[PDB]
Every structure is written in structure tokens, then in C-alpha cells.
């Protein structure tokens, strides 16, 4: 029960601190005023470097929401250095890979938003707010993604079950006015909320999506909504919460699901799943590939755990004592969070550094000891 539950929750929490100096080379912990459902490291660092994180607020109507830029002290604190005004909770927020100055958000009531940070470099607080509002959705969502080959093109996915594809390239933004933007495409191919979508890293038109309708689908954004999804397979028997393309292997991808597991997939054989990562004991909401090492990925869940997985170690055998503890591929389990985990982000500047968000206002920037990952 809940009361019984909490006591258990901490008591092992501070057992976790006790254990930290052996397990982590780094652990930064911040309590935020409001929660954040979204985190993403900015590329680049200044000089012991200092780096930047994209963040948001979840006021729930109670106060004004903020898209936030925070800076961290990395080899130890971190502070919020910019707050831009935001319509509704920042459901998720991602920078343009071509230009991290450009930010896309999914805001209140399904609205897309575009922020230009170059417009307000010096200001601590930007009240002006967004530079553009992406029109179409009618419920709120979390599926947001940017196109790596086509500058200025992005996809959104929502509880309204649609997927919209937008093109903001060439559209002037200014502190004068917020332009309205209409989708270039609108795809109805799901029967429930589109939970996550993502553009393929090395292909202009390939867009993958997953949903509560248990499907993994593959869309060719060149074809009009008149067409169907290029591929649609059942991926799990329960809702699929997340999808990630491997940044080194063009055909390898992963799905996180409410079945407590992560499935891995070869793109050209979506009819028979390659492998299943068990080991979470509640819904697996999120899944992310290391940008540094192809066999490495990370999963977070409602079981308040974050798991780091090494796929080299599959088809590998070991003592029963370890079988008690998990698969040979489970490398690291972060226990730093005392509530379900909202979002994660691999640090692209520093190998083996991760940011993670919990629903009880905690931000953590941590790194598993070098013992455990280098061999």
C-alpha cells in the first residue's frame, strides 16, 4: 500500500546513496520548483566544462509555464539561466539538429510551438513567448520529432491519434508577432494516442511511430495521407510507449512498452522481433540509444529504475548467481529516482553521462563508474 510503499521507497533510496561512491563517478541532484516532463542536452561545451540542458515546467494550470535553459557544472552544481514563457505544460521540447537555437515544443491543447533563442540571447526571462504556433492538433501529446536530413521539417503526434508533418523552413520569425503554421501533412493511421515518433537518421522521408494501439508503424512522408503506412505491425500486446532508431545501425530499432519489456527490431523483418529486454517490473516508458556506442542503450520505467543495456553481452552465459540478477546484457541500474521516470537524455559531449527526470520534481545528472563500462 502507499504508506507501506513510501517507507520502502526511501529506505532503499538512502541505501542507494550509501552505495553511490562505488557505483557512480558522478551524481548531481536538483529539486526543481515544478516538475519537468522533458530534458535534452544541448551540443557543445564551454570551459571542467559547463554544458546546457533544455527543460520545461508542469504547472498544471496553477501558474505560468516555462521553456527553460539550464547550465550544468561538469567534470558540481547547475542553475537555470533562461526562462521563456510557454502556453501550457511543456509536454516535450526538442531543438533543431541543424540549429539548436530553434526549439519545438508540444504545448497546451495539442499546439505546436516554435521558439527562436537567437532572438533573446541576453534576457533571463522572456515573457514574449513563442515565435510560431503549429495549428492542427486538438488534444495534448508527447510525440515530437525533427528531421535530420531535411532542415526545418518536423513531426508531431498526439492523444488525438493523428500525426502532423510541418515545414518551418524559410519562415521568418520575429519578436513582433507569432505566426500561425499549418501542417504540410496529416496522417490518421492510429486508433489511439501516438506516443512517440521519430525521423530516421539517414533518410529524408522515413518516419516511425508507436501508439497505445500496440502498433509499430513506418511512414513515407513523400506519399500523401491518401496512402497507408508503409509498414504496420503489432509490436507488443500492450501499449507501445517509445521508439528509438539506432544511430549506427540503419535497420536496428527499439520499442518500449507497457508490457514491462523493450523489443528490438530489424527494419526489414518487422514480423519477427529480434530480441526482448526484460528486467523492468513496470511500464517501460522511454528508450534511448547511446550516441557513442552502438550496443549501448537506456530504458526508464514506472518502476523508478533506469537501466543501461549492453547488447554485446547477449548470447553470453554466466553463473546462476548472476542469472538471479538479470540478463547478461543488463549493465547498470540507476536507483537514484524515488518516483516514476519522465524523460532521459544521453550527454553527447561526455561519454557515459546521463540526465534523468522523475515525477516528484527531481532532476539527476549521473554517470556510472568507469569500472562497470570500460573493458
Amino acid at each position: 500500500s502507499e504508506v507501506d510503499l513510501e517507507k520502502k521507497i526511501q529506505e532503499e533510496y538512502k541505501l542507494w546513496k550509501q552505495n553511490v561512491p562505488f557505483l557512480y563517478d558522478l551524481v548531481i541532484t536538483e529539486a526543481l520548483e515544478w516538475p519537468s516532463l522533458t530534458v535534452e542536452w544541448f551540443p557543445g561545451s564551454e570551459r571542467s566544462s559547463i554544458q546546457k540542458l533544455l527543460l520545461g515546467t508542469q504547472t498544471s494550470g496553477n501558474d505560468q509555464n516555462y521553456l527553460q535553459v539550464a547550465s550544468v557544472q561538469l567534470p558540481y552544481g547547475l542553475d537555470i539561466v533562461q526562462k521563456i514563457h510557454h502556453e501550457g505544460d511543456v509536454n516535450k521540447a526538442r531543438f533543431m539538429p541543424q540549429n539548436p537555437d530553434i526549439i519545438a515544443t508540444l504545448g497546451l491543447n495539442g499546439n505546436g510551438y516554435i521558439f527562436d533563442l537567437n532572438l533573446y540571447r541576453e534576457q533571463p526571462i522572456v515573457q514574449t513567448g513563442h515565435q510560431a504556433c503549429l495549428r492542427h492538433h486538438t488534444s495534448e501529446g508527447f510525440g515530437l520529432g525533427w528531421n535530420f536530413i531535411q532542415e526545418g521539417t518536423l513531426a508531431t503526434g498526439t492523444e488525438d491519434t493523428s500525426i502532423c508533418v510541418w515545414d518551418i523552413k524559410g519562415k521568418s520569425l520575429s519578436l513582433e508577432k507569432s505566426i500561425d503554421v499549418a501542417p504540410v501533412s496529416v496522417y490518421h493511421r492510429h486508433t489511439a494516442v501516438v506516443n512517440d515518433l521519430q525521423f530516421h537518421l539517414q533518410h529524408e522521408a522515413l518516419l516511425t511511430s508507436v501508439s497505445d494501439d500496440c502498433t509499430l508503424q513506418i511512414h513515407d512522408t513523400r506519399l500523401p495521407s491518401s496512402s497507408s503506412a508503409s509498414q504496420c505491425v503489432k509490436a507488443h500486446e500492450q501499449p507501445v510507449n517509445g521508439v528509438a532508431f539506432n544511430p549506427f545501425n540503419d535497420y536496428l530499432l527499439a520499442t518500449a512498452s507497457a508490457d514491462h519489456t523493450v523489443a528490438l527490431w530489424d527494419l526489414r523483418r518487422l514480423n519477427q522481433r529480434l530480441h526482448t529486454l526484460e528486467g523492468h517490473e513496470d511500464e517501460v516508458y522511454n528508450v534511448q540509444w547511446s550516441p557513442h556506442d552502438e550496443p549501448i542503450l537506456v530504458t526508464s520505467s514506472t518502476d523508478r529504475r533506469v537501466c543501461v543495456w549492453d547488447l554485446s553481452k547477449i548470447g553470453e552465459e554466466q553463473t546462476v548467481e548472476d542469472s538471479e540478477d538479470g540478463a547478461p546484457e543488463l549493465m547498470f541500474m540507476h536507483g537514484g529516482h524515488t518516483n516514476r521516470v519522465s524523460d532521459l537524455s544521453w550527454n553527447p559531449n561526455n561519454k557515459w553521462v546521463l540526465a534523468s527526470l522523475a515525477d516528484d520534481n527531481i532532476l539527476q545528472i549521473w554517470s556510472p563508474s568507469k569500472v562497470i563500462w570500460a573493458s
Partner: peptide, 13 residues
């Protein structure tokens, strides 16, 4: 504590 015990502690959480 020692490297093996560390590497399994990483897996029990």
C-alpha cells in the same frame, strides 16, 4: 568492496 561485487551491485540496484 571489489570490482566484481561492484559490477553485480550495478545490476541489483
Amino acid at each position: 568492496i571489489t570490482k566484481p561485487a561492484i559490477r553485480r551491485l550495478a545490476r541489483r540496484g
